[PDB]
Design an enzyme around this catalytic site. Structure first.
Site, PDB file in Angstrom:
ATOM      1  N   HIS A  38       0.583  -1.341  -0.046  1.00 43.49           N
ATOM      2  CA  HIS A  38       0.089   0.017  -0.240  1.00 43.49           C
ATOM      3  C   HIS A  38       0.629   1.304   0.233  1.00 43.49           C
ATOM      4  CE1 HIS A  38      -2.218   2.730   2.995  1.00 43.49           C
ATOM      5  NE2 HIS A  38      -3.083   2.629   1.910  1.00 43.49           N
TER       6      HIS A  38
ATOM      7  N   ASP B 180       8.830  23.107 -24.784  1.00 40.83           N
ATOM      8  CA  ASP B 180       8.466  22.240 -24.310  1.00 40.83           C
ATOM      9  C   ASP B 180       9.278  21.970 -23.434  1.00 40.83           C
ATOM     10  OD1 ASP B 180       7.540  18.554 -25.561  1.00 40.83           O
ATOM     11  OD2 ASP B 180       8.984  18.130 -24.507  1.00 40.83           O
TER      12      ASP B 180
ATOM     13  N   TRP C 255       7.513   0.331   4.886  1.00 45.36           N
ATOM     14  CA  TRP C 255       7.837   0.619   4.091  1.00 45.36           C
ATOM     15  C   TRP C 255       9.134   1.326   3.886  1.00 45.36           C
ATOM     16  CZ3 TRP C 255       8.859   5.929   2.267  1.00 45.36           C
ATOM     17  CH2 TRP C 255       8.574   6.950   3.271  1.00 45.36           C
TER      18      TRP C 255
ATOM     19  N   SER D  47      14.537   6.702 -12.618  1.00 48.03           N
ATOM     20  CA  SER D  47      13.308   7.993 -13.335  1.00 48.03           C
ATOM     21  C   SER D  47      13.371   9.706 -13.054  1.00 48.03           C
ATOM     22  CB  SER D  47      11.614   7.126 -13.615  1.00 48.03           C
ATOM     23  OG  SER D  47      11.112   7.993 -13.163  1.00 48.03           O
ATOM     24  N   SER D  48      12.842   9.468 -11.279  1.00 45.11           N
ATOM     25  CA  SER D  48      12.777  10.610 -10.403  1.00 45.11           C
ATOM     26  C   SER D  48      14.223  12.172 -11.185  1.00 45.11           C
ATOM     27  CB  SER D  48      12.497  10.884  -9.212  1.00 45.11           C
ATOM     28  OG  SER D  48      11.088   9.675  -9.119  1.00 45.11           O
TER      29      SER D  48
ATOM     30  N   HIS E 138      12.503  11.654   5.104  1.00 44.30           N
ATOM     31  CA  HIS E 138      11.710  13.039   5.676  1.00 44.30           C
ATOM     32  C   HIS E 138      11.311  14.649   4.413  1.00 44.30           C
ATOM     33  CE1 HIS E 138       9.436  16.053   7.220  1.00 44.30           C
ATOM     34  NE2 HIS E 138      10.147  16.841   6.416  1.00 44.30           N
TER      35      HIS E 138
ATOM     36  N   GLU F 297      11.488  13.362   0.736  1.00 39.87           N
ATOM     37  CA  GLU F 297      10.450  13.032   0.599  1.00 39.87           C
ATOM     38  C   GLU F 297       9.221  13.171   0.762  1.00 39.87           C
ATOM     39  OE1 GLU F 297      10.401  10.903  -2.312  1.00 39.87           O
ATOM     40  OE2 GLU F 297       8.037   9.867  -2.611  1.00 39.87           O
TER      41      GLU F 297
ATOM     42  N   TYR G  14       8.083  15.661   1.614  1.00 42.67           N
ATOM     43  CA  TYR G  14       8.161  17.454   1.816  1.00 42.67           C
ATOM     44  C   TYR G  14       7.823  17.070   0.361  1.00 42.67           C
ATOM     45  CZ  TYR G  14       8.533  19.182   6.312  1.00 42.67           C
ATOM     46  OH  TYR G  14       8.124  19.000   7.400  1.00 42.67           O
TER      47      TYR G  14
ATOM     48  N   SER H  66      -2.164  27.044  -5.244  1.00 42.55           N
ATOM     49  CA  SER H  66      -2.067  28.550  -4.669  1.00 42.55           C
ATOM     50  C   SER H  66      -2.635  28.566  -6.068  1.00 42.55           C
ATOM     51  CB  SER H  66      -0.579  28.922  -4.908  1.00 42.55           C
ATOM     52  OG  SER H  66      -0.038  28.918  -3.793  1.00 42.55           O
TER      53      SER H  66
ATOM     54  N   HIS I 231      13.847  12.838  13.447  1.00 41.68           N
ATOM     55  CA  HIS I 231      12.496  12.903  14.500  1.00 41.68           C
ATOM     56  C   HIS I 231      11.446  11.346  14.849  1.00 41.68           C
ATOM     57  CE1 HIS I 231      11.316  15.342  11.107  1.00 41.68           C
ATOM     58  NE2 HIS I 231      10.456  13.589  10.958  1.00 41.68           N
ATOM     59  N   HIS I 232      12.432  10.899  13.262  1.00 40.33           N
ATOM     60  CA  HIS I 232      12.202   9.462  13.410  1.00 40.33           C
ATOM     61  C   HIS I 232      13.049   8.883  13.345  1.00 40.33           C
ATOM     62  CE1 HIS I 232       9.132  10.337   9.553  1.00 40.33           C
ATOM     63  NE2 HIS I 232       9.561  11.346   9.463  1.00 40.33           N
TER      64      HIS I 232
ATOM     65  N   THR J  49       4.807  27.082   6.704  1.00 41.56           N
ATOM     66  CA  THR J  49       4.499  26.791   6.812  1.00 41.56           C
ATOM     67  C   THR J  49       2.522  27.553   6.555  1.00 41.56           C
ATOM     68  OG1 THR J  49       5.238  24.562   6.908  1.00 41.56           O
ATOM     69  CG2 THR J  49       2.949  24.510   6.792  1.00 41.56           C
TER      70      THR J  49
ATOM     71  N   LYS K  65       2.183  29.796   4.788  1.00 41.41           N
ATOM     72  CA  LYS K  65       1.637  29.960   3.182  1.00 41.41           C
ATOM     73  C   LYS K  65       0.160  29.707   3.277  1.00 41.41           C
ATOM     74  CE  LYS K  65       2.515  27.241   0.113  1.00 41.41           C
ATOM     75  NZ  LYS K  65       3.297  28.832  -0.480  1.00 41.41           N
TER      76      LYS K  65
ATOM     77  N   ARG L  26       1.100  -0.138  15.572  1.00 41.98           N
ATOM     78  CA  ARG L  26       1.256   0.076  14.284  1.00 41.98           C
ATOM     79  C   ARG L  26       1.795  -1.209  13.443  1.00 41.98           C
ATOM     80  NH1 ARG L  26       4.431   4.257  11.400  1.00 41.98           N
ATOM     81  NH2 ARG L  26       3.595   2.935   9.214  1.00 41.98           N
TER      82      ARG L  26
END
Ligand code: HEA
Ligand code: HEA
Ligand SMILES: [Cu+2]
Ligand SMILES: [Cu+2]
Ligand SMILES: [Cu+2]
Ligand SMILES: [Mg+2]
Ligand code: NA
Ligand SMILES: [Zn+2]
Lengths: 47, 261, 56, 43, 75, 98, 514, 227, 84, 84
Positions: G61, G91, G126, G156-157, G240, G242, G244, G255, G290-291, G316, G319, G438
């Protein structure tokens, strides 16, 4: 360049018949949703 | 519209991204059969389609540039950014490896003997061949620099000469390093010391091979008069990657070979 | 040495309606057809494998 | 956003069919698979 | 002796080296006295501590290693 | 004098590269590599937007600060004006294309 | 022909479409996996089997939703489609490479699927941490296949990130500064930079784990002197950013959507909006740990990581407040997408607030690895990232297709999806305060009500997605071609009509130098 | 332990787990303020026919919505930091138990003096005697002296695990090759349950933790009778 | 050590060719003589079956799956003991 | 830590003014709050007449020639002992 343009020509699938599309769309998202289920079945049917 | 009034390149459809994508599949699933259902056929097929794809993709890239005249100023400025950016991502790749190393050597587990290098490991002498390789790569850095200066001064013979000297010192490092691999008394399997030394120096080693073939390609494009005194990005990029390749070695040398041993 | 780049240019600039990866000649096509074949076959082979390896 | 009327409008009847077909294609396969879970665990 | 007391040199959540230091310390202090007699002296403290802190498995395998001579620690 | 044998662009540049190279020396910019400097934009002194066709999108940065550009098609004919600040734009035929 | 257009492409538009296509499909998959998870937890006991077959589902998932749905859709889809149009480019910079960025996805997706087919699959979470992910605890071709899927998806990314940065920086009109490009473009340019730096580190982390289970290296095996923790660092260093990387583009589209339906020319505080993103981008790189609060780290370093993680609340903040200011004097149009935007604004807030609670390591000691954090990230992903995706989709659908969606149907869908998610995830806040851990296929009887309500919630969401498929079908069924679009003066992607011609900006825009 | 329909934290059995309950009230009070402040401003913006679409001035107001949140974070960070150090604070334990995660059970080791060490498995739902908690029951409770500062050293012999006991406000990942410390300290006798808080295999959900806290005396006899 | 070879270590192909043959290469020559004026041979390290070395959690996918890729018989012992 | 604040940290006065007030200064602000959110005071170190400290091989050419230039009475003891 022989690339058609406009509504319904910028997509890789035919949009000419509302019903043939209903089928194509259905198989597409359909298979997507079902796959996980059959994978789980697969695992369950093993030893 | 139709006749374009912008200096940019619209590349014709190419089947290379697909064969290249397919090549990544072949090689990755190919490595999986090898690692597990012990077999190399798929991996062989993968490595092949891959070489085939890269050969043809860059072939087109030259065709479009050297023959078709598509690399305007606006076009090359963007290839600089792209290469620059690509090198940065490589700099961040090697960072994982240096990180792993400093993590392991800065705080050695009792399993190692609570010391570094771990008990049983016999490090190579940084003052022997590791110094030779250091000097070799450095010299190529100056000779490659002499090569790029000859190029911008239209001196064919000398560009080709400095480029040759460069290419050979680079090959000399590959061989020298290859033998150290053989003569070395430790292995990938000797815990963290081996793990850490063999993949960092190893990935770097794969980079000198990738960087040398790049230069070799530039060597031939030059015999063939491909580069002009002012348009030779393939060589600019070749030199950038080569300098990146020394600097990583300068960092491995000081960290793993000197301090870490 | 040579310097017949000009010859190569004229050739690749020739408006034969071909796409750059074929503009070069007959071998371009054999290479193309070879590469495309190994890729497809290879894909099939791996499909066969990842499946044969899907069961106990 | 403004738009021309539908070149091929979809009458409520059609829409019901389409909404139906869609839901079935999502619900049947999973239903079948889930319906026989025990039968699978029992082998 | 209740249990091993606080050791400023090993003040953080990770106590792994505390167990290790003392296990080495004890055996080294033992060997020392042994290669000297010392009126037949014995450094028990290091044992009581490393005993409290080190999990059984660690000690069992450490000793086995010391027996077979494959203990990477310097004693 | 005295060199070594590497080709010059002036002698080996081909395609668009050459085309933009020469145009450059003649001072023209048929390939929009540079920024069109403005005119007073009055009804009598409009900005002349060249174009290889009967219409062209014009972006207007009304004030130097502006993070927002005002876009609109400029068509062949009577001088038009940026919706946010008047400013005149008059289409003109493009030149050294081909 | 079909082959050349759809497999041999070099068109940002055609490529962007192929992405969204891949993204829709994958979404369908992740949706089912998400539904099995709740079908297993909606009643005390075991439905599928042991934590292995269950956790295989969970992991699948996580991976499908992050790497195969969200990333492709927001960056490859909306990214490829709109970026060249907003800055007037012909392009992308590297059209061919760009096509490869797409074609690496399906192979990567196949590997991920095959991983769950062979052996017992990868029940590893994951985060695929070792020893569990090792050749003993997880002996076999599974985890390795998971790792190869990740390598490809990464290649790819980063390849994509190189194209976006070059394009966005090097292909704007000569007189247009970066401080004149639309916030969506800034959002995709910053995200591109974040991937370019974080992804390589993940690739080095997982390449190490691979050699650890195949070439006898001991990076994370104490046996050789390795450290199972060292992996956590490497992974989280990428982990982390990721999250964001997953929201910034959403931040962009929001926006744009909010400004457009307020009838405003530009959004409130543009440069503050640019600074805000740049800051989030930067702080997101120095807070990974923090993980790892319950791992054994020094209290002083545990202090640093909670303080640094909190400062992110500030940018944030500007924003969220700037978007409210944009709505301000607005002439509001209650469109489907505007509903998705407002939904995002509040839901994302609650969720990013619930994540400030977690920044406290002291308090994180008892919240970590519980359902409280499942609530936290489901709020910013299921009703933040996904809510942006929907607004943007119903907003730009006419542009891509040339056809319009049925606004009423579009709103019903929203109404449904809203209830579904809030029901599904709200109770999980309790399940976690009250201790439910979890990655459990089952829980102590006490946790029965909330898991029962939450799973019911998960069913409503399913309905909303089945409904969305029909909604797209009807759209293509009826064929109401577009006639007029508002605010195009300030909205360039709409200037060539819907859909834009294969080749737009064949002749550059004209922009004076003041 | 947790009761049906629980909303918040399980009652605090130790002083820091109490201390955290309050720090969480403080924090949760603030998230309510902000999240309600935002829902209000939003509904406000959407509730008027009056327009003003022309340009509007920024920053003059942006100083407000920048300096304010900074203050609020200081109001959370301080209490939080305080508790954090207080947890990792200088205490002197009068006992040291060790625990070791294994793939699907915990083994405990009390070895200050004699070498008492046993296992601890969950009681299969079948083998439950009426009234016993369905998935939380363990065959061997870890017995400890109530009202005493105990030092726990968590670890594992295989994959990662995490030893957690909420009522006391404790959780410490169990990592092979690592000895993590944690100070446990109850102030009430009873049975305090917990579960393995780290994914670890087929039975990740079936390896609970139960603390039986009796007075010193009963602990001493229990130990001897335990060998 | 330091460095201050007077002048020219910048711009001009002649200058770069000069450093190439005037500095760069003589270095590689010194270092090469050096590395071979010590190119003897280490005595194979005494074998002790330490557990954190000769690690094998899974057989190498080549050979008898117990021999490292650049296995050198003389200086690299198997887990059991030296090659021979 | 690392760093990746998206875009613009190069050429253009506007961009440099932006980093000045957007990054540079806020840092000095954080660090200033920080350095003062810990701006208490160290307890003057216990005095022990170590010989390798409070060195005096020749009297300072100022004052009683026994007091260092930035002599701080509270935390700096003379060779004999703390100021008072
Ligand atoms: C969509 C991506 C996303 C987003 C945007 C967020 C945003 C943030 N998250 Fe994250 N979170 C996740 C998704 C992400 N997160 C994921 C996927 C995980 C778990 C993965 C796993 O481990 O499996 C996770 C886990 C996670 C952890 C670990 C908990 C644990 O497992 O023990 C932490 C702790 O610090 C954290 C915190 C935060 C913070 C501080 C932000 C900040 O960005 C939030 C900022 C937002 C606001 C605060 C609201 C707007 C501002 C205002 C209204 C002004 C007023 C504000 C104040 C004065 C407070 N989250
Ligand atoms: C983008 C990220 C994402 C999203 C959107 C979701 C959505 C869902 N998630 Fe998942 N979830 C995670 C990522 C995500 N999840 C992660 C990272 C984990 C942790 C794994 C670990 O522990 O290792 C997890 C964990 C997780 C758990 C806990 C498992 C456990 O720890 O034991 C549960 C259980 O309730 C769950 C529930 C759901 C549900 C019911 C949905 C439903 O809301 C989904 C409903 C469907 C959607 C909202 C998507 C529909 C939208 C589309 C498909 C787009 C359509 C496309 C176009 C418009 C063109 N998720
Ligand atoms: Cu994080
Ligand atoms: Cu466990
Ligand atoms: Cu577990
Ligand atoms: Mg954990
Ligand atoms: Na269950
Ligand atoms: Zn204007």
């Amino acid at each position: 360049s022989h690339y058609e343009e406009g509504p319904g020509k910028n997509i890789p699938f035919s949009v000419e018949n509302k019903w043939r599309l209903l089928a194509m769309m259905t198989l597409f998202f359909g298979s997507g949703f079902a796959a996980p289920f059959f994978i789980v079945r697969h695992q369950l049917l093993k030893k | 519209m139709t006749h374009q009034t912008h200096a940019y390149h619209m590349v014709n459809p190419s089947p290379w991204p697909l064969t290249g994508a397919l090549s990544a599949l072949l090689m990755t699933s190919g490595l999986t059969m090898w690692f597990h259902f012990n077999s190399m056929t798929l991996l062989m097929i993968g490595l092949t389609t891959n070489m085939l794809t890269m050969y043809q993709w860059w072939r087109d890239v030259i065709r479009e540039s050297t023959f078709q005249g598509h690399h305007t100023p606006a076009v090359q400025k963007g290839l600089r950014y792209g290469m620059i950016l690509f090198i940065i991502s490589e700099v961040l790749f090697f960072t994982g490896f240096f990180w792993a190393f400093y993590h392991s050597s800065l705080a050695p587990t009792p399993e190692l003997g609570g010391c570094w290098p771990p008990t049983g490991i016999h490090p190579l002498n940084p003052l022997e061949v590791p110094l030779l390789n250091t000097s070799v790569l450095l010299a190529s850095g100056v000779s490659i620099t002499w090569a790029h200066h000859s190029l911008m001064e239209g001196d064919r013979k000398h560009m080709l000469q400095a480029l040759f000297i460069t290419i050979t010192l680079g090959v000399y490092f590959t061989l020298l390093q290859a033998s150290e691999y053989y003569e070395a008394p430790f292995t990938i399997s000797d815990g963290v010391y081996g793990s850490t030394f063999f993949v960092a120096t190893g990935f770097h080693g794969l980079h000198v091979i990738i960087g040398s073939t790049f230069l070799i390609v530039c060597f031939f494009r030059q015999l063939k008069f491909h580069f002009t005194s002012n348009h030779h990005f393939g060589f600019e990029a070749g030199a950038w990657y080569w300098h990146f390749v020394d600097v990583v070695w300068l960092f491995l040398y000081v960290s793993i070979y000197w301090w870490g041993s | 040495f040579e310097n017949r780049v000009a010859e190569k240019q004229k050739l690749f600039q020739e408006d034969n309606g071909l796409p750059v990866h074929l503009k070069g000649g007959a071998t371009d096509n054999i290479l193309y057809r070879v590469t495309m074949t190994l890729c497809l076959g290879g894909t099939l082979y791996s499909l066969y494998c990842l499946g044969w390896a899907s069961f106990p | 956003i403004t738009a021309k009327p539908a070149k091929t409008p979809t009458s409520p009847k059609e829409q019901a069919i389409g909404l139906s077909v869609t839901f079935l294609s999502f619900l049947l396969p999973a239903g079948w698979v889930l319906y026989h879970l025990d039968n699978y665990k029992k082998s | 002796y209740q249990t091993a007391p606080f050791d400023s040199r090993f003040p953080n959540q990770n106590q792994t080296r505390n167990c290790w230091q003392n296990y080495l310390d004890f055996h080294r202090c033992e060997k020392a006295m042994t290669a000297k007699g010392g009126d037949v002296s014995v450094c028990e403290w290091y044992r009581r501590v490393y005993k409290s802190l080190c999990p059984i498995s660690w000690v069992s395998t450490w000793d086995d290693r010391r027996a077979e001579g494959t203990f990477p620690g310097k004693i | 004098a005295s060199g070594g044998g590497v080709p010059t662009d002036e002698e080996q540049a081909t395609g668009l590269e050459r085309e933009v190279m020469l145009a450059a020396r003649k001072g023209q910019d048929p390939y929009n590599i540079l920024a069109p400097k403005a005119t007073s934009g009055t009804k009598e002194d409009p900005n002349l937007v060249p174009s290889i066709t009967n219409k062209r999108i014009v972006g207007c940065i009304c004030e130097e600060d502006n993070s927002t550009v005002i876009w609109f098609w400029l068509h062949k004919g009577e001088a038009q004006r940026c919706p946010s600040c008047g400013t005149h734009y008059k289409l003109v035929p493009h030149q050294l294309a081909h | 022909m079909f082959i050349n257009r759809w497999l041999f492409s070099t068109n940002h538009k055609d490529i962007g479409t192929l992405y969204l296509l891949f993204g829709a499909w994958a979404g369908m998959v992740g949706t089912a996996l998400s539904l099995l998870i709740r079908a297993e937890l909606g009643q005390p006991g075991t439905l599928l089997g042991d934590d292995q077959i269950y956790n295989v589902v969970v992991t699948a998932h996580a991976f499908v939703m992050i790497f195969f749905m969200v990333m492709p859709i927001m960056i490859g889809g909306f990214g490829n489609w709109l970026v060249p149009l907003m800055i007037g480019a012909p392009d992308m910079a590297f059209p061919r490479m760009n096509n490869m960025s797409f074609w690496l996805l399906p192979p990567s997706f196949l590997l991920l699927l095959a991983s769950s087919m062979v052996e017992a699959g990868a029940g590893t979470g994951w985060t695929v941490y070792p020893p569990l992910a090792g050749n003993l605890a997880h002996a076999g071709a599974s985890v390795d296949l998971t790792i190869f899927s990740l390598h490809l998806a990464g290649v790819s990314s980063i390849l994509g990130a190189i194209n976006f940065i070059t394009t966005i920086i090097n292909m704007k009109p000569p007189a247009m500064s970066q401080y004149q490009t639309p916030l969506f473009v800034w959002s995709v340019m910053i995200t591109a930079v974040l991937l370019l730096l974080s992804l390589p580190v993940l690739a080095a982390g997982i390449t190490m784990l691979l050699t650890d289970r195949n070439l006898n290296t001991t990076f994370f095996d104490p046996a050789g002197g390795g450290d199972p923790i060292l992996y956590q660092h490497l992974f989280w260093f990428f982990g982390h950013p990721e999250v964001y990387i997953l929201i910034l583009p959403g931040f962009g589209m929001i926006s744009h959507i909010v400004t457009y339906y307020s009838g405003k020319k530009e959004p409130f505080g543009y440069m503050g909006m640019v600074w805000a993103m740049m800051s989030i981008g930067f702080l997101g790189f120095i807070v990974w740990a923090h993980h790892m609060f319950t791992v054994g780290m020094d209290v002083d370093t545990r202090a640093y990581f909670t303080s640094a993680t909190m400062i992110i609340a500030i940018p944030t903040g500007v924003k969220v407040f700037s978007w409210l200011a944009t709505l301000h004097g607005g002439n509001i149009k209650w469109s489907p997408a505007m509903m998705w935007a407002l939904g995002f604004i509040f839901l994302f807030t609650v969720g990013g607030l619930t994540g400030i609670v977690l920044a406290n390591s002291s308090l994180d000691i008892v919240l970590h690895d519980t359902y409280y954090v499942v609530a936290h990230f489901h709020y910013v992903l299921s009703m933040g990232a996904v809510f942006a995706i929907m607004g943007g989709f119903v907003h730009w659908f006419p542009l891509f297709s040339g056809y319009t969606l049925n606004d009423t149907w579009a709103k019903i869908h929203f109404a449904i999806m809203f209830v579904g998610v809030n029901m599904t995830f709200f109770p999980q806040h309790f399940l976690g305060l009250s201790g439910m851990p979890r990655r459990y296929s089952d829980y102590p009887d006490a946790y029965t009500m909330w898991n029962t309500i939450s799973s019911m919630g998960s069913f409503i969401s399913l309905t909303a997605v089945m409904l969305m498929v029909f909604i797209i079908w009807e759209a293509f069924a009826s064929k109401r071609e577009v006639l007029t679009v508002d605010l195009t003066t300030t909205n360039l992607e709409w200037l060539n009509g819907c859909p834009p011609p294969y080749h737009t900006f064949e002749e550059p825009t004209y922009v004076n130098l003041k | 332990m947790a009761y049906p329909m629980q909303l918040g934290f399980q009652d605090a059995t130790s002083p820091i787990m109490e201390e955290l309950l309050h720090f969480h009230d403080h924090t949760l009070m603030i998230v309510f303020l902000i999240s309600s402040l935002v829902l209000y401003i939003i509904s406000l913006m959407l509730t008027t026919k009056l327009t003003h679409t022309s340009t509007m001035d920024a920053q003059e107001v942006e100083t407000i919505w920048t300096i304010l949140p900074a203050i609020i974070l200081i109001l959370i960070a301080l209490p939080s930091l305080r508790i954090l150090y207080m947890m990792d604070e200088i205490n002197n334990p009068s006992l040291t138990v060790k625990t070791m995660g294994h793939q699907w059970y915990w083994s405990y080791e009390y070895t200050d003096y004699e070498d008492l060490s046993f296992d601890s498995y969950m009681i299969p739902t079948s083998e439950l005697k009426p009234g016993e908690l369905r998935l939380l029951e363990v065959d061997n409770r870890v017995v400890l002296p109530m009202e005493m500062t105990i030092r726990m050293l968590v670890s594992s012999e295989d994959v990662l695990h995490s030893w957690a006991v909420p009522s006391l406000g404790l959780k410490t990942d169990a990592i092979p090759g690592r000895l993590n410390q944690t100070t446990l300290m109850s102030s009430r006798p009873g049975l305090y349950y917990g579960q393995c808080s780290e994914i670890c295999g087929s039975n990740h959900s079936f390896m609970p933790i139960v603390l039986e806290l009796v007075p010193l005396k009963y602990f001493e006899k229990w130990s001897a009778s335990m060998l | 050590a330091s460095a201050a070879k007077g002048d020219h270590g910048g711009t001009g192909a002649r200058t770069w060719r000069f450093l190439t043959f005037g500095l760069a290469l003589p270095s590689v020559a010194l270092c090469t003589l050096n590395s071979w004026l010590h190119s003897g041979h280490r005595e194979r390290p005494a074998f002790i079956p330490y557990h954190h070395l000769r690690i094998r959690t899974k057989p190498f996918s080549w050979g008898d799956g117990n021999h490292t890729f650049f296995h050198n018989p003389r200086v690299n012992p198997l887990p059991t003991g030296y090659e021979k």
